[PDB]
């Protein structure tokens, strides 16, 4: 039984709530839509009959 094991490594510890909180507070999402090129493309709206 001993000779037929698989040589793993002791697993790491589970994150405590404070680590979760700081990692959540670090994250930055993007805006829903991209307003970077809303101006140089918007002639189509201005030229619709």
């Amino acid at each position: 039984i001993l000779l037929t094991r698989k040589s793993y490594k002791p697993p790491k510890r589970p994150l405590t709530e404070q680590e979760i909180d700081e990692l959540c507070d670090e994250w930055v999402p993007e805006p829903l839509v991209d307003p970077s090129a809303t101006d140089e493309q918007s002639w189509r709206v201005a030229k619709t009959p």
């Binding site: 001993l2 000779l3 094991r5 698989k6 040589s7 793993y8 490594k9 002791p10 790491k12 510890r13």
Partner: protein, 182 residues
């Protein structure tokens, strides 16, 4: 009065406890350098020396004249006690590593940077049991010697090396004293 840098060692506040895992700086300090204390184990001739010391002990005790059962039980107990003293008693390193970085691990836990059930750990597990099987054929007719030898083996040479006793410290009052957890 609060410290800017918290590098303070705690002690066990219970009876049965585990040494706390290390933080980021501690892991970096441990992994910055190959451990000079537990690297000789994997080199050329270590397994052979573990074999040879037993033969030398056997020849010595046989030189003391006594009957086969006594010589073999003496060999078994001497090897087991010596191995426990060398590999499981003292914790730390005999030389300055870093900020210290291993001040609460024994040499057995330091082997192969705390990777369990490696070939060397398997060999060092196998050796005590085969040594007991060889010696079993000589003092088999005495209940007291058989029982004592089996107890010493299974309780000193197989239990500390098990994968569940890793980082396990037992702290009683009046003998062991408060262990170190952080």
């Amino acid at each position: 009065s609060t410290p800017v840098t918290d590098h303070r060692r705690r002690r066990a506040a219970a009876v049965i406890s585990h040494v706390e895992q290390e933080t980021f700086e501690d892991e970096n300090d441990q992994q910055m350098l190959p451990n000079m204390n537990a690297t000789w184990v994997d080199q050329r001739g270590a397994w052979l020396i573990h074999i040879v010391v037993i033969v030398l002990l056997r020849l010595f005790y046989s030189l003391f004249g006594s009957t086969p059962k006594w010589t073999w039980t003496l060999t078994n107990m001497t090897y087991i006690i010596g191995f426990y003293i060398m590999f499981h008693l003292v914790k730390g390193t005999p030389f300055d590593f870093n900020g210290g970085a291993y001040d609460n691990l024994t040499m057995w836990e330091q082997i192969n940077d705390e990777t369990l059930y490696t070939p060397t750990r398997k060999f060092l597990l196998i050796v005590p049991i085969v040594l007991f099987l060889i010696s079993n054929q000589y003092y088999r007719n005495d209940m007291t010697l058989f029982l004592s030898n089996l107890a010493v083996t299974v309780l000193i040479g197989v239990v500390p090396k098990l994968g569940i006793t890793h980082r396990l410290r037992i702290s009683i009052p009046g003998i062991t004293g408060r262990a170190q957890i952080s």
